[PDB]
Structures are given as C-alpha cells and as structure tokens.
Structure 1
C-alpha cells in the first residue's frame, strides 16, 4: 500500500509531531538513476486530495529548497537547526511530491556517477520516476495529478506533461509553472524592457539600445548580430546580474553585500 521503509518517523528540529504522514526515499529514473524524493501527504483528507509534483530549476538545483524555504509543511529557521510549521503550506490541501532531479542533484545519484544529461533525458527519467512513485504508492493512482515547478522547470514540466498525457493510467489534471523559462527569446527581450522601466538603465544606454537593437516598432535583444547591440546588451547583463542587484527580487538586499 505504501513504502514503510521510506516513512519518516521523527524529523530533527521539529517541536511538534506532524498530523500527516511523510516519506523520504528513492524513485527509479532512467538507466541507473536513483532520484531522491520527499513526499508530504495532505493535512486534510490525503486519500481524496490531489497529488502534486514539485520541481525546482537550475538546471541542477534541489526541490528540497521548495520544501524547506518556499511552500513546504515546515520551514528552516536562520539557526539551520529549528523547523517551524508553515500556515501557508501547499500540503494543507494536497499530497506534495518534492523530487530532487536530475541525478546528482542534492541526495539524488546514479550507480555510474555519470551526471551529463539533457532536456529529453530528464523528461523521460522524471516520467519513469513518476511511474515508480505510483508503484510504491498504489493508493494514489486514481488521484488528480498536477505537475508543478519553478524557473528552469518551465522546460521540465511541459516536456514531462507531454509524456504523462500519453499514459492513460496517470490522472493528469493540470500544470502550474512559477517564474518559468518558457521562451529564451521572450525572456531576453522583456528583461531589457524590464531593466529600463525599473530604473536600472539610463536614457543614454536605452537610446543606444533602441537605435542599435531595434527596427521601427519591434526590438531584438535576443539573437541580434549588430556590433554595438552585443556591447550594449553586455552592459545590461553587467548591471542586472553582476552589479550587486538581487536578480531574484529587485527590491530585496543582495545576501553577502555588493561585490568588490
């Protein structure tokens, strides 16, 4: 019915025992890949609550960040010892499956230690891991399945969803992507506009960008071959991600301070 080998009995740093069941073990991916998962059952009616897969981006970043710092049932405090219950946890209404993917990420590993991978391989490996989850948790096969993620998971989730949609046994109901990479072109073009209208670039850099990267009403800040355009976009890249501004939250401080 459930892998009793994987069930977490007592988690350090928690002052109170969870009302819900939680599991930590390995799902079998492609080849010799063993993907570490941390599954947190719903706090309200787990048997009828949806199954939600959560993937963090990178590529190479852990989905355990999503649990302990974002929307997990408990959050790590600055001491790195204490865990405090999250009143806005996504597991209040859902069975949340946090998957460290691809192999090599966090506690995930492969028997050959070969961690060189690609978009198509990760989608197939995540699909095999999802098939393995339903083998270990058969009581969740008929439950509503939602595929969720962040950042690079904007690629992970839709590629995985195309493979899941071909499997009739999986009750796929939807997908949610947070601040995701959907298109490199759209992201790069919009960022230059975002940086100017948020007061990070001046009128001098903007006028030079509008003259050397744009034609009539349309702009190309993605694959432009123009000489000054590449130079100006490199200055934007230096201001946005290398000047001391927090690229993840413009109005938040940069941890560790402004670089030398």
Structure 2
C-alpha cells in the first residue's frame, strides 16, 4: 500500500508529533538516477486529498527549500535546529510530494555521479520518478494529481505535464507555477520596464533605452543588437542583479549586505538542519552521500537549457480542456517578474476572457486585496501583492488561500 521503509518516524527539531504520516526515500528516475523525495500526507483526509508534486528550480536547486522555508508543514528556524509548525502549510489540504530533482540535487544522486543534463532528460526522469512513486504508493494512483513548482520549474512543470497527459493511469487535473520562467523574451522585456517604473533607473538611462532599443510603441530588450542598446542593457543588468538589490524581493534586505548561495540569499538554516547526521538518519538518507547543499554547483554549471518559451506546451495542455492551469507571481520579484508572465498568459489568446479583478483574503483586519486575477478558459494569471520570488514565504496566508481555490477549482476572487 505504502513504503513503510521510507516512513519518517521521529523528526528532530519538532516539539510535537505530526498528525499526518510522512515519508523520505528515493524514486527511480532514468538510467542510474535516484531522486530523493519527501512526501507529506494531508492533515485532513489523506486518503482522498489530491497528490501535489512540488518542484523548486535553479536549475540545480532543492525542493526542500519549498518544504522547509516556503509551504511545508513545518519551517526551519534561524537556529537551524528547531522546526515550527506552519499554519498555512499546503499539506493542510493535500498530500504534497517534494522532489529533489534532477539527479545530484540535495540528497538525490546517480550511481555513476554524472549530472550533466537538459530540459528533455529532466522531464523524462521526473516522469519515471512519478511512475515509481505510484508503484510505491499504489493507494494514491487514483487521487487527483496536480504538478506545481517555482521559477525554473516554469520549464520543468509544463514539460513534465506534457508527458503525464499521455499517461491515462495518472489522474492529472492541473498545474500551478509560481514566478515561473515561461518565456525568456517576455521576462527580459518586462524586467527592463519593471526596473524603470520601480525607481531603479533614471531618466537619462530610460531615454537612452527608449531611443536605442525601441521602435514606435515596441521595445526589444531581449535580442537587440543595437550597440548603445546593448550597453544600456548591461547597465540595467548591473543595477538589477549586481549592485546590492535583492533580485528575489526588491523591498527585502540583501543578506550579507551590499558587495565590495546566490547573491542576497541565506540558506544556512536549512543547510544546518539537513546536514545534521540524525536528521539524515530520520530522513533515510544513505550515510555515503555527500553534504547537502541548497543548490548543486555542478548540476547548474553543466545544465543545457533547451526551451526558450513554454507557449507550445501550454497550448498543448489547454487543447484537451482537461486541466486547470494557474500562473501566480509575487509582484516584487525581479528574477521572474509578474508582468512578463501576465503578458505570457494573455498571449496564449484563450477563450472566455474575464475582466481583470482584485482577489481577496480575509485577515484579522478584514478583507484585503491580495493581488489581481486575469482569467480565461482553463487558465488564470494571478499576482500576489507585496510578495517576491518565494510567494509562500512572503505572504503565507494569501499563498494558502490561492492554493486552496486552485485545488478546489473555486473562483480566485
């Protein structure tokens, strides 16, 4: 029914024992790949709650970021020892499968330790890992399945979904992507606008960008070869990403301060926790495996990106009208800004277009605007107002509320 050998018995750092069962073990990917999973059953009706895959991006970064710092049942504290229960955990209402992927990420590995990979191989290996999951957990074969993820998983998830839709044994019902990479061109073009209108660039640089990169109403900040345009865009890149601003949340401090872990981020708490030998033992991690890192340098170094846009994947997925799709963006993220993804969804040109509206969450404090939703048939784009790249870290209530409406095919408003 379920793999007892993978069950987590007593997790260090928890002051109270979980109400739900949880598992940590390995799913077989392609070739000699073994992907480490951490599966947390629904706090309410695990038997009949949906199964929800969560992937973080990178490429080369760990989905345990998602668990321990974003939307897991408990979150790691700054001491790197203590875990506290998360009242906005996505596993309140779902069986959440966190998958460290591809091979070499975190506790994932391969027998030959060859971790050079690409989008197509990653998709196929994740597909095989999911098949393995259902072999290990056959009681979950008929549950509604959602595929979800963040940023670079904007590529992982639609490409995986395209494989999954071809497998009728999998009860695929939808996908959700947070601050996802959907189109390099829409992301790059929108970012330049974002930088100016958020006060990061001045008039002089904006006038120059407009003169050199744009023709009439249309700007090309993506693959323009205009000489001064390129120079200006190099300066924009410097300001946005190389000057002490936090690219993941414009209004957050840069961890470690302005320069003389990707810049401005600090993953020490998760790393401290996960590298505890007793935590590794509780997580059923083989002793022979190397130290845990949030991101694998070699995986990212050798990663070959293949897709420049997910337009074809989303159109394929929408064609069947079987799946509900959500793209959601913290609107203070600069790594994958909200506007590029809003442009992306609009450009899919789907039917039953709805007027753009605010969506609401009840705080104390009463009802507040949590962001805006633009909906079409089978697909919605949503902002999360005041959240950066890691939406559930920044606005955990709004994130949970959105996730609940998504899972239940309820209006986002």
Interval containing the TM-score (normalised by the shorter chain)? over 0.9
1:175 CA displacement: 0.1
Write the distance in 1 (CA, Å) between the matches of 2:5 and 2:141.
Answer: 20
Write the distance in 2 (CA, Å) between the matches of 1:176 and 1:110.
Answer: 28
Number of equivalenced pairs: 260
Match runs of 1:79-158 below 5 Å: 79-158=79-158
**Is residue 224 of structure 1 aligned with residue 224 of structure 2?**
yes
Write the distance in 2 (CA, Å) between the matches of 1:234 and 1:55.
Answer: 31
Aligned to 2:309: none
1:147 CA displacement: 0.1
RMSD: 0.3
Write the distance in 2 (CA, Å) between the matches of 1:121 and 1:225.
Answer: 32
Write the distance in 1 (CA, Å) between the matches of 2:58 and 2:222.
Answer: 20
Q: Secondary structure at the match of 2:5?
A: coil
Write the distance in 2 (CA, Å) between the matches of 1:48 and 1:22.
Answer: 16
1:68 CA displacement: 0.2
Give deviations 1:112-137, integer Å, cap 9, x for gaps: 10000000000000000000000000
Which runs of no fewer than 5 residues in structure 2 stay unpaired? 261-413
Write the distance in 1 (CA, Å) between the matches of 2:205 and 2:225.
Answer: 18
TM-score, with length taken from structure 2: 0.63
1:200 CA displacement: 0.1
Q: Secondary structure at the match of 2:6?
A: coil
Give deviations 1:72-101, integer Å, cap 9, x for gaps: 000000000000000000000000000000
1:106 CA displacement: 0.2
1:216 CA displacement: 0.6
Write the distance in 2 (CA, Å) between the matches of 1:234 and 1:130.
Answer: 41
Write the distance in 2 (CA, Å) between the matches of 1:75 and 1:220.
Answer: 42
Write the distance in 2 (CA, Å) between the matches of 1:29 and 1:245.
Answer: 38
Give deviations 1:140-184, integer Å, cap 9, x for gaps: 000000000000000000000000000000000000000000000
Write the distance in 1 (CA, Å) between the matches of 2:250 and 2:64.
Answer: 24
1:18 CA displacement: 0.2
Write the distance in 2 (CA, Å) between the matches of 1:87 and 1:241.
Answer: 33
Runs of 4+ in 1 over 2 A off after TM superposition: none
Q: Secondary structure at the match of 1:5?
A: helix
Write the distance in 1 (CA, Å) between the matches of 2:109 and 2:226.
Answer: 44
Write the distance in 1 (CA, Å) between the matches of 2:137 and 2:63.
Answer: 20
Write the distance in 1 (CA, Å) between the matches of 2:218 and 2:229.
Answer: 14
Write the distance in 2 (CA, Å) between the matches of 1:12 and 1:217.
Answer: 57
TM-score, with length taken from structure 1: 1.00
Give deviations 1:197-233, integer Å, cap 9, x for gaps: 0000000000000000000110000000110111100
1:103 CA displacement: 0.3
Give deviations 1:225-250, integer Å, cap 9, x for gaps: 11011110000000000110000000
Write the distance in 2 (CA, Å) between the matches of 1:75 and 1:95.
Answer: 17
Q: Secondary structure at the match of 1:129?
A: helix
Which runs of no fewer than 5 residues in structure 1 stay unpaired? none
Aligned to 1:69: 69
Give deviations 1:49-75, integer Å, cap 9, x for gaps: 000000000000000000000000000
Write the distance in 2 (CA, Å) between the matches of 1:123 and 1:103.
Answer: 12
